[PDB]
Amino acid sequence: TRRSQQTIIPNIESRPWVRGLSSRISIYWTIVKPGDVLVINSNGNLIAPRG
Amino acid sequence: TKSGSTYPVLNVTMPNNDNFDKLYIWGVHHPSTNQEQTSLYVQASGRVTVSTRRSQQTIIPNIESRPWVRGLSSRISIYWTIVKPGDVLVINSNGNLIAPRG
Ligand SMILES: *[C@@H]1O[C@H](CO)[C@@H](O)[C@H](O)[C@H]1NC(C)=O
């Protein structure tokens, strides 16, 4: 955003099987104030928000 | 450290079947020179990933010429990980691992 950025790099490791999977997903949150803009920049491993 | 000429990608597992929680104290070695990384851990850059079924910790070692403390320009970063009953400990490392003895 125009006030805060969050750069995340995914990790590739053999994690324990949780619910039958060795891969996970890291959820974050970002708050956009009135007037602020949301800029999502990704080249892979993105769990895009619907709204 | 390296054995002969190869440092394998260690992938061990240690389950917690005990009735109480376990605390594992493990560290990560940070060499002072680029030669110290290879003449001890072979690989160009190590990686320690001590993970559980609830939390993972991926550490990348730093190679910098730090001030001489106790006659050494290299340090070791100590970390921690709590394994609850039923949880499993998975240490995944290809170098720069200061493994816990217990
Ligand atoms: C690591 O070891 C665990 C248990 O021995 C196994 O389930 C897993 O597939 C191994 N991962 C790799 C990358 O060897």
Automatic annotation (TrEMBL), chain A:
Q: How is it modified after translation?
A: Palmitoylated. In natural infection, inactive HA is matured into HA1 and HA2 outside the cell by one or more trypsin-like, arginine-specific endoprotease secreted by the bronchial epithelial cells. One identified protease that may be involved in this process is secreted in lungs by club cells.
Can you say where in the cell this protein is located? Host apical cell membrane; Virion membrane
Q: Fill in the subunit field for this protein.
A: Homotrimer of disulfide-linked HA1-HA2.
What functional role does this protein have? Binds to sialic acid-containing receptors on the cell surface, bringing about the attachment of the virus particle to the cell. This attachment induces virion internalization either through clathrin-dependent endocytosis or through clathrin- and caveolin-independent pathway. Plays a major role in the determination of host range restriction and virulence. Class I viral fusion protein. Responsible for penetration of the virus into the cell cytoplasm by mediating the fusion of the membrane of the endocytosed virus particle with the endosomal membrane.
Q: Which family does it belong to?
A: Belongs to the influenza viruses hemagglutinin family.
The name of this protein is Hemagglutinin
List the gene name. HA
Please tell me where this chain falls within the complete protein, as first and last residue plus total length.
222 to 272 of 566
UniProtKB/TrEMBL annotation, chain B:
Q: Where in the cell is it found?
A: Host apical cell membrane; Virion membrane
UniProt subunit comment:
Homotrimer of disulfide-linked HA1-HA2.
Glycosylated residues are 11
User: Can you name the source organism?
Assistant: Influenza A virus
Any idea what job this protein has?
A: Binds to sialic acid-containing receptors on the cell surface, bringing about the attachment of the virus particle to the cell. This attachment induces virion internalization either through clathrin-dependent endocytosis or through clathrin- and caveolin-independent pathway. Plays a major role in the determination of host range restriction and virulence. Class I viral fusion protein. Responsible for penetration of the virus into the cell cytoplasm by mediating the fusion of the membrane of the endocytosed virus particle with the endosomal membrane. Binds to sialic acid-containing receptors on the cell surface, bringing about the attachment of the virus particle to the cell. This attachment induces virion internalization of about two third of the virus particles through clathrin-dependent endocytosis and about one third through a clathrin- and caveolin-independent pathway. Plays a major role in the determination of host range restriction and virulence. Class I viral fusion protein.
Please describe the post-translational modifications of this protein: Palmitoylated. In natural infection, inactive HA is matured into HA1 and HA2 outside the cell by one or more trypsin-like, arginine-specific endoprotease secreted by the bronchial epithelial cells. One identified protease that may be involved in this process is secreted in lungs by club cells.
Give start-end of the signal peptide. none
Q: Which family does it belong to?
A: Belongs to the influenza viruses hemagglutinin family.
Encoding gene (name): HA
Q: Which part of the entire sequence is included in the shown chain?
A: 171 to 272 of 566
Protein name stated in the entry: Hemagglutinin
Domain of life of the organism encoding this protein = Viruses
